[PDB]
Amino acid sequence: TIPHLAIDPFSLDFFDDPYPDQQTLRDAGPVVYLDKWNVYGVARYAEVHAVLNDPTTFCSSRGVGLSDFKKEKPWRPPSLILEADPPAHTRPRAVLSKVLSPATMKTIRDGFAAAADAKVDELLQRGCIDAIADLAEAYPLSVFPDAMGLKQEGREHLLPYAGLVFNAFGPPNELRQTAIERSAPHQAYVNEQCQRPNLAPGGFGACIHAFTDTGEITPDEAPLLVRSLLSAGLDTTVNGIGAAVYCLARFPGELQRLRSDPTLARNAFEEAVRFESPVQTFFRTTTREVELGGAVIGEGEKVLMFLGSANRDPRRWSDPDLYDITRKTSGHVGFGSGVHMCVGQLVARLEGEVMLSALARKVAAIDIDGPVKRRFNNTLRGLESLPVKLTPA
Template sequence: MSATGTPPATVSLDADPFAPEILESPLAFQEQLREAGAVVYLRRYGVHALGRYEHVHAALTEWQSLSSAAGVGLANFRHEEPWRTPSLLLEADPPLHDAPRAVLSGILGPRAIRRLRHAWAQDARELVDRVVRAPELDAVTELAQAFPLRVFPDAVGLEREGRHHLLPYGDHAFNAFGPPNELVAKGAEHIAEHAAWVGDQCARERLAPGGFGAAIWEAADRGDITEEQAPLIVRSLLTAGVDTTVHALGAVLYAFATHPDQWRRLREDPRLARVAFDEAVRWESPVQTFFRTATGDVEIGGTTVPDGEKVLMFLGAANRDPRHWRDPDTFDLTRDPSAHVGFGMGIHQCVGQHIARLEAESLLTALAERVERIELAGTPRRHLNNTLRAWSSLPVRVHAT
């Protein structure tokens, strides 16, 4: 029986998807989940899990019956107090979600892309020119982290001092979507300090004129959102706009280091940079999971999920589902990866995805100009997180032109 006394899905598993060994290497579990059934009951946590593309995609778009407002993590805000004020973008449904989403979509839209493209391309060339002077480097710290932490906070309008708080703050926020395990406990030791700095940066007076943050406050001045909503929307940018991009860049750099033929393809046609980024997001799925909560008895794949129960969507499993993807375990730039669910789907789809793509395009294009070959120079190390799939270290050898 489930936590509410209702019968679980026909198929159930005892596996713990948040166990270190599965977070380290989730593919075997994801295959088991997909093959077990359309809906699988995870007894350890009393949740219904989805691993097949068809049902994950549908669940992401059906916000009326599968709500985000009760939290996109294991905690159910109907019964539990969230550790921070919920996000107006990620943890809210219409109508509360509508105005913040519209404001941020406008700020991060095509005009921002055009304004930033030249400057970010130049920043990427400068970074690449510097790091490829050494034949070996850590692609995580020196590229995947260094570039977003250089350009994105500038675009938001953050002060330079204290930016080291961004990654651990985001890391804890995504860990907190999972169960209260050792990963959450480790982050909790210092989260007050990180959260205090991030909270301070969301204030109007701390944000530089002309940046994304100032534009959010200007929307409040126009009455598009309230003054109470403005700092929460800035916080959403800082929570979801750094770690996810860092780990997606780590994914695409790992893909190229292990697929030299695809790197040659990119060098021959640098216009494939965005395709490469989306294919890496599909292939590695930096955001692995998100939860929803049933707003009534919901039928999914022939199984009824009872009202108020949690549904755990495995984005990583959906992005490698052979029912939808041809040869899904292969990183392939001839594929059209645009239907992947790595950025979500529907009204909660990542509002900053175009900014992330511009960061990737800038960095990959600069690398393609200077680097003939990328190869592993050591054993990569995973960074474990309850929600994110990430590398902590990716030693590579670069052959610069």
């Protein structure tokens, strides 16, 4: 009944060009079995959306990586929010939601926008830049660690730590095992910055700790919640912004539409998140026997969701393989869906918006002018290097 495929979605070959294999996964059926890792897979929009929106059946507390926490030891203590189910999930979620709220966005927006404009001005002075190191990485590094309240020293640990986190959701292949064996100094740095004294007044970290007397979280929960933001909050945005620049670089017609109306900046970023899906995959674990897309899945089974595939499913999208900055994007699953839907999406969208706004106002053309190199990660899709010439408006 369920088709068995030998495709390895965590192989370098797959990362290098996932789109044909994603169609093969979609068209094989609503539910497939991946013999390579003994997991179920769903690659169509409908089943991905259904799985995300039934957290009781498709739980997160047994891990959202390949590893089943019921069978193996987690590589680090479980996240109090990502790797928790309701009801344990609910209060920590509410705290991060309030920390990363509308009001907070108002407090940081001017600074984020100023930093974006400044960066683009700087890059225009150079002309030929690497849109990954010099923009997609440099810009979030120039705003997010400060917004967290982190000291300057040690910040070089942040991207390596995130690379590790996202590789660790994968199977135990070379990417994952290499990441873990290099991890000790990055874990040590992160865990230390999560303590209250090390987080500057007014930043996200301090704000999490301040919530520890409302009864929503205890003081001993705050460091792990700071840890959540230091795991999730930087490398995601690097690859979201890199995706957007890469799209504008390949679709100059859409860059020209964006220039003509910079208020399209926020939807141009959202469309990039759909189109590239910086977060490609992650898992749920079944808590009972369940019927999904006409297939029966047993209890205690890992289910791999292909978010990127769902976001290109022609069953859901018209011209899914086109970058269209006026597309109606609502419903894409690039930020997830349901109770775990990205709690930092307002920060992500703010960064993406103000960067694309700066590009929209200051740059006339973005031309790739060197070899493009891809970065491999078990969960993240993005580039290592994107050489571009920026022409000033």
